[PDB]
RNA sequence: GCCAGCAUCAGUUUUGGUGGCAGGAUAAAUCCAUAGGAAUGUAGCUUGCCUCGGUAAGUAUUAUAGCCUGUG
RNA sequence: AGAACUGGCGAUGCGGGAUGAACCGAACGUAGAGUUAAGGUGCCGGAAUACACGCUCAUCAGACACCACAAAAGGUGUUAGUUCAUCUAGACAGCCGGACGGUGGCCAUGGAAGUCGGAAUCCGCUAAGGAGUGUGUAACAACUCACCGGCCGAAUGAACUA
RNA sequence: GCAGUCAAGCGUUCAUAGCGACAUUGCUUUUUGAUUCUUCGAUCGGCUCUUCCUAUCAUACCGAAGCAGAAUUCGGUAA
RNA sequence: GCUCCACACAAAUAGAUGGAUACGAAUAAGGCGUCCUUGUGGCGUCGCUGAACCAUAGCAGGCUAGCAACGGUGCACUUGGCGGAAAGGCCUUGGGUGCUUGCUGGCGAAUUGCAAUGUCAUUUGCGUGGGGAUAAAUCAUUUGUAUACGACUUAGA
């Protein structure tokens, strides 16, 4: 044990194939793939699957995910869709915590009052068993 | 969204914290600031010490006892920065400032309570890296605050007690989470998952 | 021991007098007033060898 | 436009040459190739100008062209396609460092015997071991520094004590205008790969006890248009 | 112009071991160990393979780049000090008054004691820093050698020595007494 | 505002002696047709002897980019009659459209030189087809193979006043 | 008699949702087909560094990735 | 300083400029609702600690300027440009080596040899090497640059503008 | 101050008009420290006591000087 | 005249109306879990705001009959320990005492009339009889270590 142990400090990098979540705009919570880099602040994205138009966008409008896939530089929308499907990024996104949190919160928002009552009753039922287990 | 809000001054900027706090008191929220000795100012130490000296040389000449009273403590520096925002010469401003309490360190009863922050006043978020900043305990001890050595000695005890508390709470939480995971997969939990809980 | 500091408050008399000073200097300069070479095709422009061809 | 280092300008007569000098050397070597019959390569890595002038005065009929390696490489031809005459890059590749490219019409063996019999004295030229060993005496140092009877020499100049003390790392004191040391400083041993400061010490004390003999590698004949390699020193 | 990324390389010989969490640096080798805090600097570290460590700066300016280069130089000095070491030779000179240089152990603190500098009764005391070893060079008149692995501590102690014996209110063209750094180098 | 490119043509008014005059054309960057036509007459008065009363505009039209999603490296000639006789500037901008290049150019000039719309003249914006004709280093920076870079300081916009988290800026 | 709530209307005003249309290069684009072209050179191939298969420079214009231009 | 119009205050409240006879807006009956002007939207203070692109760190920055005053410039602080040059027949920076010969050139002086001074300032051999850029010596010496070459392997320097 | 010289730049879309930073000449009386020194029309100064400025006379610390030491001269921080 | 309780009436008001829900440190780095060589370790995982967590059904929340479990929670005692920065609070033992919506049943609500916040969270004061215990300072006088007068400083059953 006399080898160097320098840290890594992982980072989500801006690269072709890096998929991103759009947090503000008309899309407002859709996915897209970076296809080209214009400068430190601007990139070109394309999501045909979820339906966002190919455009130039600032990076403040999006947020990088840890996911990426194989994609050449300056690809077209059809090639983007094909590589998207072949990599199956939508399923990975659905499996991730993050997307589950989003889906959970919108479900909670769409809950009706009666469903709220049901959830409260169920939480009490669960609490009884859990406190018994403890 | 609370009756009273406890704010840890660590990592904050004096003027921005003063602004948000003042506009909260004038709206009627009760606020309690702690750890003012760890508060921060933008700019290098030299600049702000020079500024405090510029303030300190100001005094009524024919009688010094009735002039600007130069309070050395970080809590009082923050109080000055805040009072300069509030119209403290009105009953409204007096009632506002009487909703505030500032403390060096975290004394009782607030040590056993939750503290929060203000993200639009934090140094690490508001400032650009590669920029000198100043800390208020150092500044106050430079301009004549004779109590920084007691507050550290007391915080070093508070932190140990809090670490014991956290080590207990964290094992309890492990037990609770494990019991919940075992309770999971039941049809009740599946229904709750469907409904978003 | 830090020394004094000049003030930035403008004290209205001064900004009136400056307006008058400038309104006078403008007339004086207008009175004294009574007594191209195109820079070319600048380099670093990559397609500069094409502007030489629309002449004839 | 600022936070740069300012270039120390000084006002002398001479000025840089540029590409015209190199083109001139190019044309000279190329017109001498057509003229003379035999052409040789001489490796002259560290020389004295009087030694080079002696070598030049040894024949006023033959030519010797120094200059930049890459320029002579281009004049000859480094590629088999880019070449002035045939089988010439085979010679041009031999050039290693400071190359003095010679032209002549004289017999092969005269040149071959001359440039192995020619030998002179020179300094030891660091990165090259010296066949000598020097302990300086432990009293007052003289201008030759342990090479002749001190009753011939005079003490060296006091102005050299900062140099000896700092750049040469010698422990040095001075009692009056004379330089002095306490113990006999050894500088070198025979068969010891020399360093820069050892070489400068021997140069300062004036020791030309190294054998300068020019090395010749190759040789090319125009009528045959063939190369021939002979490492001769 | 906000260079998109700039890099510097740090070579590590075989005997040396380098450990770097956030910006603290520990370097271990034959001669000992060394530690250094660089949290003021805001750069990034990374390792390639056991002999090459890279330091990087993203979207920075001239001062940031300069900080990168000097960080490289500091780590290289640490490696050289833990492998070979640093050795500074100083010589003390006098014309009339012999300067007496000794060591004293006072409360276990290792003070260097200088006496009779230019004929004064004052006793000049210089504290020795941790990681520095003084020895009086034999068979060389009036020379003292400071050895260690921290070039900073060694050079600063030598500077303290040559500063404490400064001449005051006298022409230095005439009065040459003092302590001077004769040589810097390795062990 | 967000600029647009406009084609403009001018006829200077016919006479007896001269029917059908020579129809000078120009390309303008501007917010709207009014400003575009004013700029047209402003340049035409400099080039030739015409006037808004002595002339007329024939066909105002818009020009949209042929490929407004393809990323491009534009080179722009600029000049501005200051302070001396007029002097030129070459700049390079990596962007998708001539409109975006001109917008960010005007903003960059206003920032770095305090030079204004009234002061500025656009000579020629031109896409560079081939790499290795890109001269400026800040654009050369972004053409390298398999370019990647992080964003190490993330700071998250907060909707609330208070937070219970001691936030983190990671990535 | 006093203070108020609601429904349907009128006048003035503010703020949302949604539908049908006309134009412009009868938007440009994306997209589909087709002819060429090239590099921040894909596959394949050649010669080597050679840590077990990763590698540098040479080839090759879509091949087991794609991109650009024109035309329709 | 004199004349010639025009506008305003004098007689005039209102909003803004922290405050103000002559600055910006706008001129007045008593009330209500809506929209604005000029000026503004961190707190005092009603209104975005809004969005976007850049620049700037000031040992008392700045927070309307006015080649209005201090004023004409200075600065190894920073950014963006223009012009001219060097460069794989290898640029810039570093180390290393060469840096010669007639010649210790002529006057001068106790002495002066490239370097206290005056005036010539040439040729030779060269890759290049000044009748010599500075340190130095009583004088020589030695070192140095100017200039050339070797190693290194791709950009660099100067003058200007904002 | 007056009158000039020169020239880094500026320069009616002027090469041979004008402007012009930094330098610099003349006039002021003289060359051998002998200059006898030599005044020429203004429409305030003095007590007690406090504070402030620095543009520092002394004290404190430093830098440069042919600064041997001693003393002194110039300058930096400092009220 | 003061004093504990078996409380008729008064009192909640810079502004209650489910809960102020406790690690430190860093940010060009960290939290949680897990393993082992115990480290500046390996592996896995999380963030991308509290849009969370906990509570949360019953007349402003009643009167009762059960099923399953020994869990949850309130009230007053009770054990033991900790805590001095302004501790005035935190945790814990045991036994009582009620409730439990964890699950299934049975009765009552009505007319506040189509809304009116529609009122819900200490005691001093007098019934209360708890119901017994028994200090000082100031003036006046005096002292002079003090003093314009006040004050100060001392003494006197």
Radius of gyration of chain B: 22 Å
Shape of chain B: elongated
Question: Most extensive interface, residues per chain?
Answer: A-F, 19 and 16 residues
* CATH homologous superfamily placement of the largest domain in chain B: Ribosomal protein L13
Question: Can you count the helices of chain F?
Answer: 3
The counted number of beta strands of chain F is 6
If strands are numbered along the chain, what order do they take across the biggest sheet of chain B?
A: 1-2-4
Tell me the number of structural domains of chain B. Answer: 2
Helix and strand string of chain B, N-terminal first? EHEEHHHEHEHHH
Strand order of the largest sheet of chain F: 2-1-3
Could you say what the CATH architecture of the largest domain in chain B is? Answer: Alpha-Beta Complex
Based on secondary structure, the structural category of chain F is alpha+beta
Q: Order of SSEs of chain F, N→C? A: EEHEEEHEH
Oligomerization status of the protein chains? part of a larger assembly
- Count of domains of chain F: 2
CATH topology of the largest domain in chain B: Ribosomal Protein L13p, Chain: A
Question: In the CATH classification, which architecture of the largest domain in chain F applies?
Answer: Roll
* Shape assignment of chain F: elongated
Percentage of residues in helical conformation of chain F: 10-25%
- Main CATH class of the largest domain in chain B: Alpha Beta
**Tally of separate helices of chain B:** 8
Organism (chain B): Saccharomyces cerevisiae (strain ATCC 204508 / S288c) (Baker's yeast)
Cross-link (Glycyl lysine isopeptide (Lys-Gly) (interchain with G-Cter in ubiquitin)) (chain B): 175
Pfam family, one (chain B): Ribosomal_L13
Subcellular location (chain B): Cytoplasm
């Amino acid at each position: 044990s006399t080898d160097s142990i320098v840290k890594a400090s992982n980072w989500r990098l801006v690269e072709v194939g890096r998929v991103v979540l759009i947090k503000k705009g008309q899309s407002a919570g859709k996915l897209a793939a970076i296809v080209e880099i214009i400068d430190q602040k601007k990139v070109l994205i394309d999501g045909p699957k979820a339906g966002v138009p190919r455009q130039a966008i600032n990076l403040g409008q999006v947020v990088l995910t840890p996911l990426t896939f194989a994609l050449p530089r300056g690809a077209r929308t059809a090639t983007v869709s094909k590589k998207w499907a072949a990599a199956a990024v939508c399923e990975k996104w659905a499996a991730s915590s993050w997307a589950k949190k989003i889906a959970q919160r919108e479900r909670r928002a769409a809950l009706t009052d009666f469903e709220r009552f049901q959830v409260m009753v169920l939480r009490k039922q669960k609490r009884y068993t859990v406190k018994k287990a403890l | 969204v609370e009756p009273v809000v406890v704010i840890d001054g660590k990592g904050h900027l004096v003027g921005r914290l003063a602004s948000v706090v003042a506009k909260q008191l004038l709206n009627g929220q009760k606020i309690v600031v702690v750890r003012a000795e760890e508060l921060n100012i933008s700019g290098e130490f030299f600049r702000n010490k020079l500024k405090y000296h510029d303030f300190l040389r100001k005094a009524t000449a024919f009688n010094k006892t009735r002039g600007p009273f130069h309070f050395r403590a970080p809590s009082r520096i923050f109080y000055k920065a805040l009072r300069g925002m509030v119209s403290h010469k009105t009953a409204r401003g007096k009632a506002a400032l009487e909703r505030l309490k500032v403390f060096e360190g975290i004394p009782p009863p607030y040590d056993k309570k939750k503290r929060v922050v203000v993200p639009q006043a934090l140094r690490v978020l508001r400032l650009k890296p590669g920029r000198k900043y100043t800390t208020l305990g150092k500044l106050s001890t430079s301009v004549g605050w004779k109590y920084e050595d007691v507050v550290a000695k007391l915080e070093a005890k508070r932190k140990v007690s809090s670490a014991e508390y956290y080590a207990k709470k964290r094992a309890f939480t492990k037990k609770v989470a494990s019991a919940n995971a075992t309770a999971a997969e039941s049809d009740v939990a599946k229904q709750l998952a469907a409904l978003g809980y | 021991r830090v020394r004094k500091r000049q003030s930035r408050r403008t004290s209205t008399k001064l900004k009136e007098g400056i307006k008058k000073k400038a309104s006078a200097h403008r007339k004086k300069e207008k009175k004294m007033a009574k007594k191209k070479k195109d820079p070319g095709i600048p380099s670093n422009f990559p397609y500069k060898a094409k502007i030489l061809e629309e002449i004839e | 436009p600022r936070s740069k280092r300012s270039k120390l300008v000084t006002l002398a007569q001479t000025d840089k040459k540029g590409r015209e000098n190199k083109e001139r050397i190019f044309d000279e070597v190329r017109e001498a190739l057509d003229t003379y019959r035999y052409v040789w390569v001489l490796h002259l890595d560290d020389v004295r100008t009087p030694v080079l002038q002696e070598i030049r005065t040894s024949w006023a009929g033959s030519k010797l062209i120094m200059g930049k390696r890459k320029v002579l490489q281009k004049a000859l031809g480094e590629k088999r396609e880019e070449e002035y005459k045939e089988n010439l890059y085979q010679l041009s590749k031999l050039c290693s460092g400071v190359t003095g490219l010679l032209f002549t019409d004289e017999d092969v063996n005269t040149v071959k015997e001359y440039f192995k019999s020619y030998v002179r004295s020179d300094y030891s030229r660091p990165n090259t071991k010296a066949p000598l060993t020097f302990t300086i005496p432990e009293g007052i140092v003289y201008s030759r520094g342990g090479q002749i009877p001190a009753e011939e020499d005079v003490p060296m100049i006091h102005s050299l004590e900062p140099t000896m003390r700092n750049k040469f790392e010698i422990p040095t004191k001075i009692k009056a205008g004379k330089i002095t040391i306490d113990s006999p400083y050894l500088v070198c041993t025979e068969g010891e790969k020399l360093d820069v400061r050892q070489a400068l010490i021997l140069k300062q004390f004036g020791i030309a006890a190294s054998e300068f003999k020019v090395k010749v590698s190759a040789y090319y004949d125009n009528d045959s248009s063939t190369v021939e390699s002979t490492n001769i020193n | 112009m906000k260079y998109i990324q700039t890099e510097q390389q740090i070579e590590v010989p075989e005997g040396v071991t380098v450990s770097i969490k956030s910006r603290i640096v520990k370097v271990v080798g034959p001669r000992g160990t060394l530690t250094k805090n660089l949290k003021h600097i805001d750069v990034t570290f990374t390792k390639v393979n056991n002999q090459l460590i890279k330091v990087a700066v993203h979207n920075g300016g001239r001062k940031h780049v300069a900080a990168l280069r000097t960080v490289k130089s500091l780590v290289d000095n640490m490696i050289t000090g833990v492998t070979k070491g640093y050795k500074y030779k100083m010589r003390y000179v006098y014309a009339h008054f012999p300067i007496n240089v000794n060591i004293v152990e006072k409360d276990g603190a290792k003070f260097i004691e200088v006496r009779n500098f230019l004929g004064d009764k004052k006793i000049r005391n210089v504290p020795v820093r941790d990681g520095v070893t003084i020895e009086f060079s034999t068979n060389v008149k009036d020379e003292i050698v400071l050895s260690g692995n921290s070039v900073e501590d060694v050079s600063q102690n030598a500077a303290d020595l040559q500063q404490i014996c400064r001449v005051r209110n006298k022409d230095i063209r005439k009065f040459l007494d003092g302590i001077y750094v004769s040589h810097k180098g390795f062990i | 505002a967000h600029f647009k490119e406009y084609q403009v043509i001018g006829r200077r008014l016919p006479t007896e002696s001269v029917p059908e005059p020579k129809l000078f054309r120009m390309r303008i960057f501007a917010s709207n047709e009014v400003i575009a036509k004013s700029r047209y007459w402003y340049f035409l008065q400099k080039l030739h002897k015409v006037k808004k009363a002595s002339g007329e505009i024939v066909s105002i039209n818009q020009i949209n980019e042929a490929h407004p999603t393809k990323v491009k490296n534009f080179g722009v000639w600029v000049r501005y009659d200051s302070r001396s006789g007029t002097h030129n500037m070459y700049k390079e901008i990596r962007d998708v459209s001539r409109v975006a290049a001109v917008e960010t150019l005007y903003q960059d000039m206003a920032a770095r030189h305090r030079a204004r719309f009234r002061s500025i003249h656009i000579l020629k914006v031109a896409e560079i087809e081939k790499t290795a004709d890109v001269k400026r280093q800040y654009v050369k920076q972004f053409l390298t193979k398999d370019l990647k870079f992080p964003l190490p300081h993330r700071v998250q916009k907060s909707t609330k006043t208070f937070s219970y988290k001691r936030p983190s800026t990671f990535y």
